[PDB]
Amino acid sequence: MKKEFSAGGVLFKDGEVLLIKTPSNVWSFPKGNIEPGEKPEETAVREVWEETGVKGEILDYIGEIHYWYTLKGERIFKTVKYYLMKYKEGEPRPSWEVKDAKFFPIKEAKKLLKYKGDKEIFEKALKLKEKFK
Amino acid sequence: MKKEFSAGGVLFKDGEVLLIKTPSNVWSFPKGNIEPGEKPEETAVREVWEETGVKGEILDYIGEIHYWYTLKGERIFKTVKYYLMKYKEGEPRPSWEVKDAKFFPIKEAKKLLKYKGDKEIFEKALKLKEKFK
Amino acid sequence: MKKEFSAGGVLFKDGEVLLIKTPSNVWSFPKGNIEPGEKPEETAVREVWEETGVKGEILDYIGEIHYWYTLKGERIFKTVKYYLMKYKEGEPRPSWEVKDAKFFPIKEAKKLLKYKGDKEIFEKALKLKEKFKL
Amino acid sequence: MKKEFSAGGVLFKDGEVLLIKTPSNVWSFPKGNIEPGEKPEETAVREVWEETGVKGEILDYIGEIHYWYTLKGERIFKTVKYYLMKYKEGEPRPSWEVKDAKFFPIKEAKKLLKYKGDKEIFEKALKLKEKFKL
Ligand SMILES: [Cl-]
Numbered sequence: 001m002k003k004e005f006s007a008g009g010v011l012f013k014d015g016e017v018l019l020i021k022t023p024s025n026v027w028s029f030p031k032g033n034i035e036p037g038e039k040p041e042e043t044a045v046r047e048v049w050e051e052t053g054v055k056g057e058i059l060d061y062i063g064e065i066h067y068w069y070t071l072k073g074e075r076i077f078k079t080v081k082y083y084l085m086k087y088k089e090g091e092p093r094p095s096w097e098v099k100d101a102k103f104f105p106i107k108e109a110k111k112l113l114k115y116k117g118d119k120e121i122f123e124k125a126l127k128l129k130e131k132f133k
Numbered sequence: 134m135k136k137e138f139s140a141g142g143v144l145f146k147d148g149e150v151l152l153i154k155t156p157s158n159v160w161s162f163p164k165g166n167i168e169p170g171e172k173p174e175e176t177a178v179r180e181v182w183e184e185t186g187v188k189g190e191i192l193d194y195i196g197e198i199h200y201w202y203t204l205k206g207e208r209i210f211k212t213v214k215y216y217l218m219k220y221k222e223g224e225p226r227p228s229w230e231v232k233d234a235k236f237f238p239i240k241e242a243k244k245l246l247k248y249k250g251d252k253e254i255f256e257k258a259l260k261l262k263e264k265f266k
Numbered sequence: 267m268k269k270e271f272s273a274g275g276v277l278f279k280d281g282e283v284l285l286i287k288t289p290s291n292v293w294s295f296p297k298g299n300i301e302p303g304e305k306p307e308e309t310a311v312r313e314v315w316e317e318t319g320v321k322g323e324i325l326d327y328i329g330e331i332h333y334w335y336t337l338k339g340e341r342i343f344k345t346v347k348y349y350l351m352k353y354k355e356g357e358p359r360p361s362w363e364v365k366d367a368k369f370f371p372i373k374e375a376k377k378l379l380k381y382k383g384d385k386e387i388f389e390k391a392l393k394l395k396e397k398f399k400l
Numbered sequence: 401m402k403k404e405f406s407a408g409g410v411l412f413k414d415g416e417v418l419l420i421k422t423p424s425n426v427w428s429f430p431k432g433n434i435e436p437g438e439k440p441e442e443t444a445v446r447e448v449w450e451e452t453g454v455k456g457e458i459l460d461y462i463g464e465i466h467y468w469y470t471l472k473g474e475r476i477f478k479t480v481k482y483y484l485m486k487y488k489e490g491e492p493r494p495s496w497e498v499k500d501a502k503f504f505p506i507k508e509a510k511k512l513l514k515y516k517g518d519k520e521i522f523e524k525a526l527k528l529k530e531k532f533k534l
Pocket residue numbers: 001002073074075
């Protein structure tokens with residue numbers, strides 16, 4: 001078994017948040033694995049851009065969710081740190097690793113989320129979004 | 134005899150104290166192993182910096198706590214020296230190591246702390262803190 | 267609960283195995299925490315080098331062991347992956363963290379090992395090294 | 401409570417060993433405290449040079465001596481690692497920390513050393529010295 005380190009973001013663009021659809025047909029947030037020597041904030045920005053083609057700015061740390069899963073017979077413990085981001089540039093274009101990447105009005109996003117983990121993160125994110133905007 | 138000597142910091146910013154959330158979900162103070170050739174004070178400043186992204190200045194030496202634990206059938210002796218710090222700059226951001234990093238009002242901090250050692254150290258820190266202001 | 271992931275190495279040179287003498291006087295294998303963004307193989311080669319001054323080359327994955335312990339009343343899970351290595355260069359020189367670093371004939375090393383995990387891993391290592399004629 | 405790390409050497413020149421005289425008037429081996437980032441072998445070379453003005457080359461690790469003592473109202477667990485060294489450059493001169501620095505024939509050195517640890521380290525060093533043209 002091994003541990004996996006990932007970081008991603010809840011990026012907002014004028015009342016809308018960036019979401020992606022996983023191979024399992026679940027809408028969640030853009031995230032990705034750490035690169036050698038990166039701090040989580042660095043990983044978060046890079047992976048969001050690579051997965052959605054959208055470049056964002058980190059405003060604050062929201063939280064972390066974790067879970068076990070298997071890949072090729074080995075148990076993997078994954079931890080994902082999430083950061084509140086604000087739109088910079090680019091357009092949503094899902095990489096081959098996600099079924100889709102699209103902006104959704106906050107109202108629309110709330111319902112799409114499945115995993116209680118993502119919903120908790122989004123909730124926290126919205127609250128933090130206030131103090132900043 | 135295995136001996137693990139660490140150093141940590143109890144940093145304050147306008148009536149608030151800096152705490153980190155450990156993998157056990159318990160809120161505590163940033164601390165880490167004192168590397169060979171490193172003064173405990175340097176270890177404390179570095180660990181606070183690395184785990185929270187907050188830079189602090191040491192005001193005084195609070196105290197030290199001792200405890201043992203068993204690993205692979207062997208007794209290990211551990212001690213942690215704590216230093217009182219005052220905020221200098223930086224914004225609370227957790228490392229891949231911790232779940233969170235946040236400032237808490239003293240009243241609330243006393244509530245979050247769990248380890249008897251953290252409580253004893255915090256109480257000593259509050260008294261030593263008056264010396265300054 | 268907190269989970270710790272480490273990696274270590276079982277390195278052979280001219281038919282002998284490299285062991286380190288821990289603070290408790292127990293001879294064991296070098297190992298260390300797998301840093302974020304680090305492959306377990308990188309961790310093993312690095313730890314062997316830092317603890318013994320010996321540079322090794324990964325031959326293959328041996329296996330992993332795990333165990334639990336309590337710290338400050340909290341349960342902690344720890345697992346360690348081990349890799350088979352062949353000597354590349356360097357002389358045994360212990361780090362500040364260990365008492366000694368030395369090569370031992372397999373027969374002697376088997377008697378020196380104490381930790382259950384080390385014994386299990388060494389057994390697997392001995393069966394695996396046959397392929398590389400070490 | 402704190403840990404202290406030092407390293408030094410049993411350095412030979414033309415069959416003689418380099419000794420220093422401590423403030424307590426005892427002949428012993430040159431050694432000193434680790435600096436930030438140093439491996440023990442690095443500390444040993446630098447400290448022997450600073451303490452005696454003699455540059456030595458490390459040939460092997462001898463062993464270590466450890467003990468608890470009190471410094472400025474605090475218990476310190478000190479570990480001193482020793483290395484067999486070959487003379488390379490310099491003339492012995494005591495630093496401000498020692499009373500003298502001088503080379504002595506092995507037979508005389510054996511008689512001069514007083515601390516049990518020093519005697520044991522010297523015994524080990526002489527055995528290791530046999531493997532080199534030192
Ligand atoms: Cl597995």
